[PDB]
Amino acid sequence: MWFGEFGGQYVPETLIGPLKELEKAYKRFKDDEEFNRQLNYYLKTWAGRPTPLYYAKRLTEKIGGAKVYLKREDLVHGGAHKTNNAIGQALLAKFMGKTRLIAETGAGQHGVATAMAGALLGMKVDIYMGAEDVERQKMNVFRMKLLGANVIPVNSGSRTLKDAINEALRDWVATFEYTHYLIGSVVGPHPYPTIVRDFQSVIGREAKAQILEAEGQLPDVIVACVGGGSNAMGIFYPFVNDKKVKLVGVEAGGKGLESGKHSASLNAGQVGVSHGMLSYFLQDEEGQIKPSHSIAPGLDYPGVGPEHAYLKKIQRAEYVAVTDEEALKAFHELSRTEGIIPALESAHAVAYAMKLAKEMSRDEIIIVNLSGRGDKDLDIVLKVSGN
């Protein structure tokens, strides 16, 4: 349950049993033949795995430095890497005999992934969402309802993701016997940070095989955006024991790191406890988590995974930040240059990789995790960038 000093299970006693039962079922099923057969089957036929690894030749040559490859999680069913975890946990829940899934969501993206996986496996889905987020994500809320999920607006507290998490936790205490709490990033009490990372590591395993086929060697740098940290852990984890492979996580710089309007928890946060985990959080004088900002809706998780805090501490991975403006420019640039519209979240990784590529030599290789597609962000970009 610990990654160095980060992680743990900081929850009330009523949740210890349910977390124990989940940990027990996961230890059994994670290496179970039938479970992995079905999981790999759903991932192949329904999700469309494997996703390709694409060499961005025009972008590479335009920048004039290192080769830039894109791991195309944007092509997974639903348009984002979140599906990998949603299927894994939903199937796990079915194997544990649960009939219902609950989840929280801020951007709505995890809510959608959860609703998709629940519909697939024939399970009831309830999604807790802060009323302020509900208001701003009307199409995601509609998507969830199309998928047969029930969206429950959370009106308490600040009507945001933090408040939804608290409601979801309260629901699970009472309903855990038939309900699985499907956490959407590498966060929360153990064993969630481990489970989510395990279910996303397929990205890194495919990427490793794909890059070896393409270039006959491991990459020099892997770059991924970091909200809660799941897409980054997914692509990082199989390369952790490859000492030569540099790992860079990109947080939301928002309006700027000194502006006080960003979501760079590792970069500017402090150690604290929330959502059952000891990790880095941006918190106020009174210890309360403060509002995070980013143009990218999905980089709004309040905090960061304990495994990322650990990788930072031991200096296995480096963490940087990219601003809203920089992310936007990358969003336009990739669309024009390679014909791929990325998610605004993923654009942060693209933005940094472009800066990094310029510094590196042409024989060198950068893999960017393109965690999602940008169809969902077109309304946003039109408003901000203009017609």
Residue 265 touches Na ion, criterion: CB under 5 A = yes
**Contact positions with a copy of itself (CB under 8 A) in 275-334:** 332
Residue 95 touches a copy of itself, criterion: CB under 8 A = no
Q: Is 57 a catalytic residue?
A: no
Q: Is 98 a catalytic residue?
A: no
The CB-of-99 to a copy of itself minimum distance in angstroms stands at 14
- Measure the CA angle with vertex 38, ends 35 and 42; round to 5°: 135
In angstroms, rounded to a whole number, what is the distance separating the alpha carbons of residues 295 and 337? 22
> Which one of 104, 132, 326, 338 is the catalytic residue?
104
Stretch of residues binding a copy of itself (CB under 8 A), selected from 51-59, 191-199, 299-307, 350-358: 51-59
In angstroms, rounded to a whole number, what is the distance separating the alpha carbons of residues 346 and 231? 10
> Which one of 263, 292, 294, 371 is the catalytic residue?
371
- DSSP state, residue 49: P
Which amino acid appears at position 132 of this protein? E
Nearest Cα to Cα of residue 320 among 226, 228, 250, 227: 250
In angstroms, rounded to a whole number, what is the distance separating the alpha carbons of residues 161 and 164? 5
Residue 37 contact, options a copy of itself, Na ion, none, Cβ 5-8 Å cut-off depending on partner type = none
Cβ atoms < 10 Å from Cβ of 295: 23
Residues 96, 119, 218, 268: which binds a copy of itself (CB under 8 A)?
Answer: 119
Residue 44 touches a copy of itself, criterion: CB under 8 A = yes
Give the residue carrying structure tokens 């042409």.
362
Residue 199 touches a copy of itself, criterion: CB under 8 A = no
The CB-of-48 to a copy of itself minimum distance in angstroms stands at 4
User: Given the complex with a copy of itself, which of 307 and 333 has the nearer CB atom?
Assistant: 333
> Which one of 82, 162, 208, 312 is the catalytic residue?
82
What tokens does 339 get? 């014909």
Q: Is 104 a catalytic residue?
A: yes
Spell out the residues 6+ positions from residue 212 whose beta carbon is closer than 8 angstroms to its own: 218
Cis peptide before 50 (omega within 30 of 0): yes
Q: Name the 3-class secondary structure at 63.
A: helix
Residue 109 touches Na ion, criterion: CB under 5 A = no
Stretch of residues binding a copy of itself (CB under 8 A), selected from 47-55, 179-187, 256-264, 348-356: 47-55
Residues 35, 176, 192, 301: which binds Na ion (CB under 5 A)?
Answer: 301
Which amino acid appears at position 319 of this protein? Y
Catalytically active residues, by annotation: 82, 104, 371
